[PDB]
């Protein structure tokens, strides 16, 4: 029900950075720099600008001190300076609030457009950015858990098909989704850069930000993040994983920052750059769709996500999902999942897999 | 208390093989050969003899067809032929039933002694074994999930200190254990070969066999086993893991064979060969003790284990544990676990970690 | 020298497959299927069609029986059916011989254009292809050395700047090159799909095909290929590596097929999809540029490459490079290389690194 | 010429435990072992640095000692009981070797210790007593992408391998693999106590010299990272040989050179040898997969270069020349030969190294 503008979509290259508001900058720095090993591009008493090992643009993550932890912006880089004008015209045709800043909203980004999009998310579009030393061969700096790239964002929104249509008009290509036989869609993944995704929609009350994901080179890098968190006696901040995803086929881990912003560590999905890339649809009751090994999805993964801000810095209204809940239909009292479709053996009814019920 | 014999203990080298009774030999072969990649030393319509990648003795595992799935023997290799006599004299002094076979109980083993030990377990001691081709450089055969060695057994027994003393007299050294602040021992690990263990005692109703463990070279090999089980749509046979152990520091996975015999895959523990190797005691309520990342221990891991046989092929009666139950004290309705000792934050009261309760 | 056409360039997605002529089809099958584990999409007495683990198009490699081993076609997939028409118009404007087949030149490809390009290489452009089962989660089939994608081609051509300009006009973006202070270019790497390259130019006598490259998930997968070749006692077919590239930063290995077609195994280069991706130039005398660890480049790597065919199936005549030879200036009698620019300590004069001269 | 088997019982040797290396510039050596390789400092002052690997509980695996001439000062083996130190003294006494006993050790963190100038001219130490330290095996907050987890072995250059082998076998070491030719020459032997492929090894050549000290990693990528880091630091000229897969031992490996040219091997994933009838493996010297399984050429410096060793007065041991055939000469020299497949001319190399190279 979001109309396709007459104005052409901006040519979006990829997800580029997120700006997160955090309440205690020093505690956040300990997490993202000391625990996770991200590289400081700039910092002061109010903000920390961080980048991954292989990045050449100024940053992939901005931590901004503020009163309420929330997503401030999720930024996509566009192909040319002119694409920023294209974005402004596009979102103005959609009737969205926009704000244009020739000098950027954060350090190391030039001409940029921020919008309150039709789903209530603060999107930024920019071309201009300050190039920095690309650390991709700085093995003298390489950590055993090195985060090498920003991979994607994941957004919680109550009506997945409505947002899917809007993102497809914007140029995102759907690669995978989760549906049921009744016709409910629970989640969709969509890309620009030729990986499984740049952003994704997860069914739930929204707008809220589900997570920001970074890549590693290898699976052992993700294991090391887990081991290091055990060493630091902060294993309570490992939310879910590590595991192998069904959707995306990536090896993964979810952890929680000091303000409960969820970060995913991700590796080794597949190439999606061909225009006829085969879509994959999974059934919601398939117990291998989220964790391929059938490990249970922790309930907080379905219920918890970050606030997002509007262009005034105020928290966006959250709308209740009315479509069926993935948690409820799979691991809730009236839910079920299977290992083999139609087989009662290896099926779970009214609880999660591996012998667990909801706490 | 089990008396220390006057007779010298047999010099035990290592765990060498297990004989498991299985109910459907073909189904078991699918699991151990086709899924897990173990190498066939000999098979007929009654037995399958299997070895790991780096083994040079005849076998590490014998699958024997029978009416009731159970452990038939846990075999230890001794240093010299004379150690078989030593084991005979030792167990006779303990008042245990023994059976001696100059030409072995299974193919590829020579002079062998089997015993119903003081804890009810069928132990075998042997030196003589038919050598086979050591496959350690046969990379043309190497699987993405290759099992390279037999690492250990784990035994369920009601009274851990009683068993521990017996095993120490036999020459096993304790490397790690789990206790509480009230004098209860929940588990102990003990070695001969200079790894964390060759066998272990887990508190519970027994005698029962908790598992047999095989090693891989690297953590990705264990990940591949999980991945393969997902592709074969048998992820319901992944019981617990993968994870990092607290006790032992090994990367691990537990899976279930067609008869529900538990197999652990294990890698990268540490060297214990010095006689003053520091013993490590973990508190039972430490939520990083079993899984270092704090992932919950699946309840079946505490309740399910294999029957064991006596020397007549009959199932050993099960003696109930009267000491506190690790399940109950950690993840049961009245249980407790912590992430940081003394910190209420990251602690769990009457439920498991990560948001789960017992199903 | 090579003019920019008025006609628009076809939109090229990525390298897609190579057709290689081989002399003994069974021996070639042993190599690509039995040794390297590629998946058969189709085969008969004359050809074998093979694909990588993550591929969904019909094939990445066609082995065609013929009298003279040679490259028959290097194929690029284009974005739309209409880009095949664009390709035809573009190459006809360049005055190149072209051949159009509505039902393709090989099985599983539809409308296709083959051209004898300005550098004498047989390029194919196509959109239409038969989709097959994407094997990306078939962990039941996954090898310890699994080849997961086709990554790139590498072409030997006498004049690198001339070929570079032509490929740039065709829409390829240079990511890295090797030059000296005199102004000779020795090699260039250029991409469409957002990795370091889809093809590359290596200075030398040509046209010849230097190699076709496949990727693995992890570095251990490349190690396994070397280990397996040692086990099969064909380590003499390991040409160079394994190693870490300076240019591209990828972990690599070069091996030789039964007809001495060179295959590279490659993993973990970086993202190049941004239009201002920084272009990296290395000095020819930098001993870390080709192997980052300073291992010597085997002489055959510079001198040997595969013949290429014209559209009639005849071998293309070789044109000699007149520009300086990378072999000669670095490891030849009058060459030199350095570890640290301007440091004689760690420099090599008139010989290779690590204590070796040319055989 | 043969080394007699003493009447006195051999000390029960557990494993290689540490090496003491004399270095010329302590700060430069610290940079290499601590900043490049990530070893953990147990103790340091301005004369010495005591270092241990990730999983070690004894005081140290390596002692760096400032001195005028870079050399091996002692190769230390831990014995099973304090009485094995007495057994070691009695044993070497009966062998007619020079011995020195210190009730309070020769270095910090070691108690009662015996040092000897052994029959092959090497400075061996035997000790039981050592100061236990924090075992860092779960300190993943300190774990490096190239983490060295254990001390694995020593490798010694000696002119007569069979003579050395017999002496080590009497000392209780068990031979696991060796390299020989069809004319009765032995070029190298590997021997263990702790149930891995080796605790020490003999390499045929002019000696006594120390060929290398080896440390383990958990995984192959950890060794790759060491190479990658050296490239990043622009010290790839200190990577001598590798990385590779060994034929003998089956281990993944790398050889690098410290500031004084002391060779360090990084090593992972050999196999279990603890059974007393562990099958022995003999490789032919001309087999081009014996040292590098992938057939990569062995660097000439690997055959010719090795560290001086000291006697008990701190003076360099005189070198005795090998008279048996040279592994370098017979495989990669002008008159050398190696094969890929025994009996196959295809994939063989005459008067040169594999992969297209000659001796520099
Ligand atoms: Ca208590
Ligand atoms: Cl998921
Ligand atoms: Cl456990
Ligand atoms: Cl290269
Ligand atoms: Cl070697
Ligand atoms: Fe995600
Ligand atoms: Fe276990
Ligand atoms: Fe290449
Ligand atoms: Fe070594």
- B179 CA → ligand 1 middle, Å: 10
- Which ligand gives the minimal distance to the CA of A199? 6
3-state secondary structure of D92: helix
Say how far apart CA A32 and CA A144 lie, in whole Å: 15
Element holding D357 (H helix, E strand)? strand D357-359
Cα–Cα distance, C63 to A258 (Å, whole number):
56
Least distant ligand from the CA of D294: 5
Return the DSSP state at C176. E
Report which of B216, B203, B204 is spatially closest to residue B252, judged by C-alpha positions.
B216
Strand pairing report for B356-358 and A356-358: antiparallel
CA distance B327 to B304: 12
Q: Tokens standing for B344?
A: 């209420």
Q: How far apart are CA B305 and CA B293, in angstroms?
A: 24
* Partner-chain contact C137 A194, CB within 8 Å: no
A207, A199 Cβ separation under 8 angstroms: no
**Interface with chain A: mutation pick from D135, D136, D138, D141, highest number of A CBs within 10 Å:** D141
Enclosing H/E stretch for D204:
strand D200-204
Q: Give the C-alpha separation, C5 to C22, whole Å.
A: 35
Q: Is A99 annotated as a binding residue?
A: no
Q: Which two tokens stand for residue B173?
A: 């050294």
Got the DSSP string for D176-192? Answer: EEEEE-TTS-EEEEEEE
How far is residue A320's CA from residue A325's CA, in Å, rounded to a whole number? 11
Burial D65-98 (b: 16+ CB within 10 A, else e): bbbeebbbbbbbbbbbeeebbbbbbbbbeebeee
Instruction: At D321, give phi and psi (nearest 5°).
Output: -80, 140
SS3 assignment, position B249: coil
Q: How far apart are CA C238 and CA C255, in angstroms?
A: 5
Element (H, E) at B191: strand B185-191
Domains and CATH numbers, chain D: 11-149 (3.10.180.10), 150-288 (3.10.180.10), 289-360 (4.10.1270.10)
Give the span between the Cα atoms of C157 and C201, in whole angstroms.
6
Residue A293, CA atoms < 13 Å, CB-side half-sphere: 24
D234 interface with A at CB cutoff 8 Å: no
Distance B57 CA to ligand 5 centre (A): 27
Which residues, at least 6 apart from B110, have a Cβ–Cβ distance to it below 8 Å?
B102, B103, B104, B126, B127, B128, B129
CA–CA separation, D48 and D60 (whole Å): 12
- Give the Cα separation of D218 and B216 in Å (integer): 12
Across chain C, which distance is largest between two alpha carbons, in Å?
A: 61
Q: Rounded to 5 degrees, what angle do the CA atoms D157, D163, D164 make?
A: 40
Tokens (6 digits) for A351:
């609880």
Closest residue of A to D222, CA-based? Answer: A144
Ligand 8 mean position to A241 CA, how many Å? Answer: 36
Beta bridge mates, B100: B113
The 3-class secondary structure across chain A, one letter per residue, is CCCCCCCCCCCEEEEEEEEEEECCHHHHHHHHHHHCCCEEEEECCCEEEEECCCCCCCCCEEEEECCCCEEEEEEEEECCHHHHHHHHHHHHHCCCCEEEECCCCCCCECCEEEEECCCCCEEEEECCECCCCCCCCCCCCCCCCCCCEEEEEEEEECCHHHHHHHHHHCCCEEEEEEECCCCCEEEEEEECCCCCCCEEEEECCECEEEEEEEECCCHHHHHHHHHHHHHCCCHHHEEEEEEECCCCCCEEEEEECCCCCEEEEEECCCCCCCCCCCCEEEECCECCCCCCCCCCCCHHHHHCCECEECCCCCECCCECCCCCCHHHHHCCCCCEEECCCCCCCCCEECCCHHHEEEC
CA atoms within 13 A of residue B278's CA, in its CB half-sphere: 17
Reported residue count of chain A is 359
Burial class (CB in 10 A: 0-12, 13-18, 19+), D35: exposed
Name beta bridge partners: B212.
B153, B263
- Plot region of A260 (φ>0 → left; ψ -120 to 50 → alpha; else → beta): left
How many Å lie between the centroid of ligand 1 and the Cα of residue B279? Answer: 21
Q: How far apart are CA C350 and CA C335, in angstroms?
A: 5
Question: D97 at the C interface (CB within 8 A)?
Answer: no
Residue C203: phi and psi, rounded to 5, are: -65, 130
**Residues C47, C37: Cα–Cα separation, whole Å:** 17
Query: How far separated are the first and last CA of chain B, in Å rounded?
Result: 38
- Cβ-based burial of B238 (10 A; exposed 0-12, middle 13-18, buried ≥19): buried
Task: Specify the 3-state DSSP secondary structure of D230.
Answer: helix
Q: What is the CA A178 to chain-centroid distance, rounded? A: 17
Instruction: Name the CA radius of gyration of chain C, rounded.
Output: 20
Cβ-nearest to A136 among C137, C193, C270: C270
- Return d(Cα B13, Cα C206) in angstroms, integer: 63
> Chain A residue with minimal CA distance to D36?
A140
Q: Cβ neighbours of residue D29 under 8 Å, at least 6 residues apart?
A: D23, D49, D64, D258, D259, D260
Interface of B with C in 212-231 (CB under 8 A): 218, 220, 224, 227-228, 230-231
- Per-residue tokens: D350: 């005459």
Residues in chain D: 360
Bridge-based pairing of strands C98-101 and D281-284 is unpaired
Contacts of B345 in chain A (CB under 8 A): 236
CA C269 – CA C247 distance, rounded (Å): 9
| Helical packing angle, B219-231 and A219-231, nearest 10° | 120
Residue A54 to chain B, least CA–CA distance (Å): 24
- Report the 10 Å Cβ neighbour count for C344: 10
Which of chain B's residues have a Cβ under 8 Å away from the Cβ of D138?
246, 249, 292
C108: left (phi over 0), alpha (psi -120 to 50) or beta: left
Residues in binding site of B: 152, 181-182, 211, 264
- Torsions phi, psi for B261 (to 5 deg): -65, 130
What DSSP element (H or E) covers D89? helix D83-94
Ligand nearest to the CA of D263: 9
Smallest Cβ–Cβ distance between D78 and the set B54, B270, B274 belongs to B274
Give the burial string for A304-339 (b: 16+ CB within 10 Å, else e).
bbbbbbbbeeebbebeebebbbbbebbbbeebbbbb
Identify whether the C-beta of residue B208 lies closer than 8 Å to the C-beta of residue B143: no
Cβ burial of C113 (10 Å; 0-12, 13-18, 19+) is buried
Method: X-ray
Residue entry with tokens 């490798």: D155
Alpha carbon of A200: minimum distance to chain C alpha carbons (Å): 20
Nearest-angstrom CA–CA distance, D354 and D359: 11
- Spatial separation of the C-alpha atoms in residues B53 and D271, rounded to whole Å: 10
- Strand locations in D258-326, DSSP E? 263-268, 281-284
Show Cβ contacts of residue A63 under 8 Å, excluding neighbours closer than 6 positions: A20, A22, A25, A28, A29, A32, A47, A48, A50
Which tokens in the block code for residue B302? Answer: 């505490």
Between the alpha carbon of residue B9 and those of residues B78, C212, D140, the distances in Å are 10, 63, 39
| Selected residue of A217, A354, A358 to mutate for chain B interface (largest B Cβ count, 10 A) | A354
Distances (CA, A) of B193 to A57, B56, B196, D275: 53, 16, 9, 10
Contact across the interface for B193 and D274, Cβ inside 8 Å: yes
What's the token pair of residue A115?
A: 């919008």
Q: How far does the centroid of ligand 8 lie from the alpha carbon of residue C328, in Å?
A: 21
Q: Which H or E element spans position C76?
A: strand C70-78
Q: For A225, phi and psi rounded to 5 degrees?
A: -60, -45
Question: Cβ of B193 and D194 within 8 Å?
Answer: no
**What are the backbone dihedrals phi and psi of residue D165, each rounded to the nearest 5 degrees, phi first?**
-60, -45
Residue B242 corresponds to which tokens in the numbers above?
């993968």
User: At how many Å resolution was this determined?
Assistant: 1.6
Nearest neighbour of A137 by CB, restricted to D140, D221, D232 = D232
Which CB contacts under 8 angstroms, 24+ apart, belong to C343-351? C345/D237, C346/C287, C346/D236, C346/D237, C347/C287, C348/C287, C351/D360
Cβ distance B24 to B69 under 8 Å?
A: no
Question: Using a CB-CB distance cutoff of 8 angstroms, which residues of chain A are in contact with residue C219?
Answer: 218
**Residue D352 with chain C: CB contacts under 8 Å:** 359
Spell out which residues of chain B touch residue D250, defining contact as CB-CB under 8 Å.
136-137
* Burial of residue D315, with CB atoms counted within 10 A of its CB: 0-12 exposed, 13-18 middle, 19 or more buried: exposed
Query: What's the rounded Cα separation, in Å, for the pair A95 and C62?
Result: 53
- Cα D270 to Cα B56: distance, rounded to the nearest angstrom: 14
Chain C contact present for A281, CB below 8 A? no
Residue whose pair of structure tokens reads 């954060």 in the numeric block = A106
End-to-end CA distance of chain C: 38
> Which chain C residue has the Cα nearest residue B139?
C228
C-beta of residue C279 within 8 angstroms of C-beta of residue C300 = no
Q: How far apart are CA A11 and CA A191, in angstroms?
A: 12
Q: Which residues of D touch C293 (CB under 8 A)?
A: 227-228, 230-231, 236, 239, 243
**What is the least distance, in Å, from the CA of C129 to any CA of chain A?**
10
Tell me which ligand sits closest to the C-alpha of residue A200: 6
**Contact call for residues D28 and D36 (beta carbons, < 8 A):** no
Residue D113: strand pairing partners? D102, D127
Cβ pair C122, C116 in contact under 8 A? yes
Breaks (C-N over 2.5 A) in chain B follow: none
């Amino acid at each position: 029900e979001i109309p396709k503008p007459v104005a052409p979509a901006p040519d979006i290259l990829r997800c580029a950075y997120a700006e997160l508001v955090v309440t205690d900058l020093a505690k956040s720095r300990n997490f993202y720099v000391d625990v996770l090993g991200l590289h400081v591009s700039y910092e002061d008493e109010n903000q920390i600008y961080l980048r991954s090992f292989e990045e050449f643009i100024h940053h992939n993550l901005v931590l901004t001190k503020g009163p309420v932890a929330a997503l401030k912006a999720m930024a996509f880089r566009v192909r040319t300076p002119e694409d920023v004008d294209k974005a402004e015209a596009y979102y103005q045709e959609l009737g969205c609030r926009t704000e244009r800043r020739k000098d950027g909203f954060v350090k190391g980004i030039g001409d940029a457009l921020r919008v309150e999009d039709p789903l209530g998310f603060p999107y930024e579009f920019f071309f201009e950015t300050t190039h920095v030393e690309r650390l991709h061969m700085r093995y003298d700096l390489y950590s055993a858990g090195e985060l090498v790239r920003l991979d994607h964002f994941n957004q919680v929104t109550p009506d997945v098909p409505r947002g899917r249509k809007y993102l497809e008009d914007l140029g995102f290509r759907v690669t995978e989704d989760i549906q049921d036989d009744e016709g409910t869609t629970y989640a969709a993944w969509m890309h620009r850069k030729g990986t499984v995704h740049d952003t994704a929609l997860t069914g739930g009350n929204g707008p809220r930000l589900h997570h920001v994901a970074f890549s590693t080179h290898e699976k052992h890098n993700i294991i090391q993040i887990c081991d290091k968190m055990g060493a630091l006696r902060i294993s309570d901040r490992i939310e879910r994983g590590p595991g192998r995803h069904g959707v995306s086929n990536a090896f993964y881990l979810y952890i929680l920052d000091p303000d409960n912003h969820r970060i995913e560590i991700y590796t080794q999905d597949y190439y999606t750059g061909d225009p006829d890339n085969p879509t994959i649809t999974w059934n919601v009751h398939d117990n291998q769709r989220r964790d391929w090994w059938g490990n249970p999805v922790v309930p907080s993964w379905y219920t918890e996500a970050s606030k997002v801000l509007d262009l005034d810095g105020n928290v966006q209204e959250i709308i209740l999902r009315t479509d069926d809940s993935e948690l409820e239909v799979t691991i809730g009292a009236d839910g079920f999942s299977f290992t083999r479709a139609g087989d009662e053996d290896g099926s779970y009814h009214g609880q999660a897999s591996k012998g667990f019920k909801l706490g």
